[PDB]
Design a protein around this nucleic acid. Structure first.
Ligand SMILES: Cc1cn([C@H]2C[C@H](O)[C@@H](COP(=O)(O)OP(=O)(O)OP(=O)(O)O)O2)c(=O)[nH]c1=O
Ligand SMILES: [Mg+2]
Ligand SMILES: [Mg+2]
Length: 571
DNA sequence: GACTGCTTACA
DNA sequence: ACATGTAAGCAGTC
């Protein structure tokens, strides 16, 4: 049984003096075992001899300072667990999960210290964690401005702040561990929690591990959420409207839709109805023209003919190769006229309902009876379960190295794979969800402004009679009338602003209606736009050309990472 | 360069 | 040992 420690660094913010000026560590099950000091060499000496599991909140930041030390002290990168090497799990998107430091072997025992990311377990700011877990949190923060030379001596106040930060994570992590949420990440606990319910025995019988190749071609049919701005409204200031939001859309599909299980059977040509294998994926070649009065539903990515984000009214005189679930193919056929159709091949699946019942009943209840970070964690259990099923077996990551200038560089590592989970599930969950969303959007064609995944934005303020029977503020899978706005402007996908009607309840602002409102909330939704920049946005300046030099970006410099303000522009 | 790589936000 | 797609900005790559 290895010891567990909560750790943190305070670092300088100078590009060309970049260094740790303070560290802290605290035993997660013995808060009286802790140490605060001013030296990274002193900390790393402890790291080397402690033979424990370490946690930093946001390992991506602290790990840069740690790997810079390792590379300067005779440690090189190796996955082969040799003496005086470190291993990392850094993903190809650049998520840090682990730094594993190997000092050697005494018998059949590895001598090593392992460092993990507590952000993977608790993806919130430290203060949010303290508020929502109900833990002691000190007011204010360390002065990020003060001049701190080498050997700078930590004040009593800074010492208290550092100790508070490490103790908050310690207490929160311990709360989770004692419930059995002890794995590396929140998603890992979700899949493990699901396997506990249905049994591991039943898991690999119902969700067999597919060959890497079969999983790859299943994945051809795997697509995300429907994100679409009606061109009619693009860049226009508009009046009153409303937003409908599905109550947990993906889990809702998991709960009640017919979904694939088992090994698929390959077929050639056009799928022939098989009651025992009622779901399929079909490889189709065709040209297509959107029918009059229908929303476009076809997006083709990685093509020189089409912009990947654009929903297509026409194939433009080129033959489209498409891999499609039966739910998607049926939707495509309702919205489009098809030309020169070739049914090439496909895969058909056994199917059933209700495999996720107990797991979703558990976590929807925890979500409903919880608040803040604790609610968001229950939400994450539900959503990471879907993601886990569609886990990409390509786990090739990044290998750190020390550049000639003293800064960390990264190279793509040797290709590697892990077993698939069950990707057909992912295919049909998103498929049933697109179906849910698109059919509702299509039923409100005369009023539809905008869709993103689980939501429809409409003109006017009354519920359409055609969706009245599937609207509910709480029921899983139903549409909630979430808000009503006084005015809005949608510039493009994931880029819009709204003036929302609010009313006060018990001193708390709640969504209201055009007759039952006291306050107007300005809301900004803009992919890539960080929170400080959002505060700069007005109805008047929210247009193409809006720019602020306020976006923090982490720059690798000699010694570690500095956050430097970069520009963000609506192009 | 158009591309991808390196980062965030919206789901 | 590592949940998902999608959409975006900007510094690099002839
Ligand atoms: C936020 C989020 C959403 N999604 C997908 C699945 C969700 O059903 C869908 C819409 O999610 P959201 O509307 O963002 O979140 P939610 O409905 O689960 O919870 P809430 O509305 O209370 O904030 O997008 C993920 O797969 N992972 C995520 O982390
Ligand atoms: Mg939503
Ligand atoms: Mg929602």
């Amino acid at each position: 049984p290895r010891k567990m420690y909560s750790c943190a660094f305070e670092t300088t913010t100078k590009v060309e003096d970049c260094r740790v000026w303070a560290y802290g560590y605290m035993n997660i099950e013995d808060h009286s075992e802790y140490k605060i000091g001013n030296s990274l060499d002193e900390f790393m000496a402890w790291v080397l001899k402690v033979q424990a599991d370490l946690y930093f909140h946001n390992l991506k930041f602290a790990g840069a300072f740690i790997i810079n030390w390792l590379e300067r002290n005779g440690f090189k990168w190796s996955a082969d667990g040799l003496p005086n090497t470190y291993n990392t799990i850094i993903s190809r998107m650049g998520q840090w999960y682990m730094i594993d430091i190997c000092l050697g072997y005494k018998g059949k025992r590895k001598i090593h210290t392992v460092i993990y990311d507590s952000l993977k377990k608790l993806p919130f700011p430290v203060k949010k964690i303290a508020k929502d877990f109900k833990l002691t949190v000190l007011k204010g923060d360390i002065d990020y401005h003060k001049e701190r030379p080498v050997g700078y001596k930590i004040t009593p106040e800074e010492y208290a702040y550092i100790k508070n930060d490490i103790q908050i994570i310690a207490e929160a992590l311990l709360i989770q561990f004692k419930q059995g949420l002890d794995r590396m990440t929140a998603g890992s606990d979700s899949l493990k929690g699901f396997k506990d319910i249905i049994t591991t025995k039943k898991f690999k019988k119902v969700f067999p591990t597919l060959s890497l190749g079969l999983d790859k071609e299943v994945r051809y049919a795997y697509r995300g959420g429907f994100t679409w701005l009606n061109d009619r409204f693009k860049e226009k200031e508009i009046g009153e409207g409303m937003v409908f939001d599905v109550n947990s859309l993906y889990p809702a599909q998991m709960y009640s839709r017919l979904l694939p299980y088992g090994e698929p059977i390959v077929f050639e040509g056009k799928y022939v109805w098989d009651e025992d294998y009622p779901l399929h994926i079909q490889h189709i070649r065709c040209e297509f023209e959107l029918k009059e009065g229908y929303i476009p539903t076809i997006q083709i990515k990685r093509s020189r003919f089409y912009k990947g984000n654009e929903y297509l009214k026409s194939s433009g005189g080129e033959i489209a190769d498409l891999w499609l679930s039966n739910v998607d193919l049926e939707l495509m056929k309702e919205h489009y006229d098809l030309y020169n159709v070739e049914y090439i091949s496909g895969l058909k699946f056994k199917a059933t309902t209700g495999l996720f019942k107990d797991f979703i009943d558990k976590w929807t209840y925890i979500k409903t009876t919880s608040e803040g970070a604790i609610k968001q964690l229950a939400k994450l259990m539900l959503n990471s379960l879907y993601g886990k099923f569609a886990s990409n077996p390509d786990v090739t990551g990044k290998v750190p190295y020390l550049k000639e200038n003293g800064a960390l560089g990264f190279r793509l590592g040797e290709e590697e794979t892990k077993d698939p989970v069950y990707t057909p599930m992912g295919v049909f969950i998103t498929a049933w969800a697109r179906y849910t969303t698109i059919t509702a959007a299509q039923a409100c064609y005369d009023r539809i402004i905008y869709c993103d995944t689980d939501s429809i934005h409409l003109t006017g303020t009354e519920i359409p009679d055609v969706i009245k029977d599937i609207v509910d503020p709480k029921k899983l899978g139903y549409w909630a009338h979430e808000s009503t706005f006084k005015r809005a402007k949608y510039l493009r996908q994931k880029t819009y602003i709204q003036d929302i009607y609010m009313k006060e309840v018990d001193g708390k602002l709640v969504e209201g209606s055009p007759d039952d409102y006291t306050d107007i909330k300005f809301s900004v939704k803009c992919a890539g736009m960080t929170d400080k920049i959002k505060k700069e946005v007005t109805f008047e300046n929210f247009k193409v050309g809006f720019s602020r030099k306020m976006k923090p970006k982490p720059v690798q410099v000699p010694g570690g990472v500095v956050l430097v303000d970069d520009t963000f522009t609506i192009k």
